[PDB]
Amino acid sequence: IKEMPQPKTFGELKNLPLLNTDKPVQALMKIADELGEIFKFEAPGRVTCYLSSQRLIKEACDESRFDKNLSQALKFVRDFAGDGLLTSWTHEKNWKKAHNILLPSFSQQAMKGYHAMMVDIAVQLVQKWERLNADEHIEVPEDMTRLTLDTIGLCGFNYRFNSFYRDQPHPFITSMVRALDEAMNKLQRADDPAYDENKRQFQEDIKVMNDLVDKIIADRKASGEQSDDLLTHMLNGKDPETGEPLDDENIRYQIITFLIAGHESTSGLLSFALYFLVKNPHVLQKAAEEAARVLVDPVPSYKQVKQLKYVGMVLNEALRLWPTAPAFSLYAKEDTVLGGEYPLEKGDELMVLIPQLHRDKTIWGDDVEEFRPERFENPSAIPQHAFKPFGNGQRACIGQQFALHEATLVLGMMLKHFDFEDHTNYELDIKETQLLKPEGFVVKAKSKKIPLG
Ligand code: HEM
Ligand SMILES: NCCc1c[nH]c2ccc(O)cc12
């Protein structure tokens, strides 16, 4: 029945120059504000359409009709994350095999085994802030990223990146960041010899990542040690379907994937949650009151983290306004009609624009830009597929429980131990890589002088 709107075009380049910008997701959100719930986005060689309403995304989330697509962004990241969970297609044998093997390591129950390692890193964060001098401040996303990288290293392969001991990045990290950057940069360009150097550097970075991870795996098998880490489960697990274990090359890709998937996504969430708390002091007060009520011991237990309900609402309200992995891609499994109005062909692509979904006034009411964690008080009232910050169905985030347990523990501890001051009246500036984060967000903390165990 209807023709899809489309944003402004640039002759032969179609819509491509619209993503030639430091902040493409935020540019796409303004397009959606103008064009509405669905728009066609064309590039040379390719077309996708971006969805922004709960009414159409609830249909895109029908797994009988649509499966996960590798967006052009993920295709580029697949050049180094290979067939790990995030960059594999659903129909590749290593997807279902690794998904079956790793699901038991990522459940709510499994979080009891990672809890003590998470605490070890959260205590390092608290001690860093306790030890600042009166005149100093905190570089919020920088310190969040030290906690989240350390927590994934320790829980994922018993490796200490010791990020609180340094300001220079780990070699793996240098190459990872630079490969992510190149993958991001390729979205925009239009094979010229001007890129011979980008190409050589990318190859060099892929080799550094593979060499360093292949050695962690070799070391582990050579030593025989059993930890409560992901690497142990991968080396010992068998997929109950095929009966097969993962091989070493696939294990290497799962480890690279954990670092690409489970680190800056969670540090972004912690940084946005802090930003909203300091911009909303009544919400900060209510969250700090819960942390004081619940965290009655020198360090938090697993069960006490589960009891930080309001802190959990705070994190979901940050994920509502700024989901840190802001889009995911799908393809039509068969010809079908979306919303009774937009016929799609088998293989056609869709993009779910999560921050715009989360602004659907028909779901959230008119106060959609307000930070109000109490929206999440009776979650059964939320319609299906309205709130999707960890994606969809069997291709949802396998790390969801991990990220929320880490973020709830850390933000609980921060709220127990410090008062916070937005001393610069910081203006939100969201920096975009594949993921979102507040850039330049700084605060001052004033210790409540409560001892740690
Ligand atoms: C607040 C933090 C996080 C957010 C918002 C988040 C978001 C998401 C989203 C939106 C997807 C689906 C992407 C797609 O459909 O293309 C996804 C997939 C995934 N995430 Fe996360 N994630 C976070 C934390 C983590 C953590 C901590 C880990 C690992 C420890 C992780 C590991 C993965 C993996 C491996 C997948 C692919 C799962 C599969 O397809 O089988 N994530 N994530
Ligand atoms: N698991 C949250 C990270 C995440 C989801 N989708 C992604 C796509 C590319 C990327 O580098 C990272 C991601």
Curated annotation (Swiss-Prot):
Changing residue 258 to E: Ineffective covalent modification of the heme macrocycle. Substantially slower FMN to heme electron transfer for the arachidonate-bound enzyme. Product distribution biased towards omega-3. It is found in: Cytoplasm. Residues 1-453 are annotated as: Cytochrome P450. Induction: By pentobarbital. Expression is negatively regulated by repressor bm3R1 at the transcriptional level. Changing residue 398 to P: 10-fold increase in binding affinity for lauric acid. Transmembrane segments: none annotated. The record marks 265 as: Important for catalytic activity. (9Z)-hexadecenoate binds at residue 50. This protein is a target of protein engineering. Its selectivity-directing and activity-enhancing mutations have been extensively studied and the designed mutations allow this enzyme to act on non-native substrates and/or in order to enhance production of synthetically desirable end-products. It comes from the Bacteria. Changing residue 327 to P: Enhanced activity with small non-natural substrates with altered product profiles compared to wild-type. Changing residue 398 to E: Ineffective covalent modification of the heme macrocycle. 2-fold apparent limiting rate of flavin to heme electron transfer for arachidonate-bound enzyme. Heme binds at residue 397. Changing residue 261 to Q: No effective fatty acid oxidation. No effect on electron transport from NADPH to FMN. Nearly wild-type level of high-spin conversion with laurate/dodecanoate, palmitoleate and arachidonate. In the N-terminal section; belongs to the cytochrome P450 family. Functions as a fatty acid monooxygenase. Catalyzes hydroxylation of fatty acids at omega-1, omega-2 and omega-3 positions. Shows activity toward medium and long-chain fatty acids, with optimum chain lengths of 12, 14 and 16 carbons (lauric, myristic, and palmitic acids). Able to metabolize some of these primary metabolites to secondary and tertiary products. Marginal activity towards short chain lengths of 8-10 carbons. Hydroxylates highly branched fatty acids, which play an essential role in membrane fluidity regulation. This is Bifunctional cytochrome P450/NADPH--P450 reductase. It comes from Priestia megaterium (strain ATCC 14581 / DSM 32 / CCUG 1817 / JCM 2506 / NBRC 15308 / NCIMB 9376 / NCTC 10342 / NRRL B-14308 / VKM B-512 / Ford 19) (Bacillus megaterium). The lineage of its organism: Bacteria, Bacillati, Bacillota, Bacilli, Bacillales. The gene is cyp102A1. The chain holds residues 3 to 457 of 1049 of the full protein.
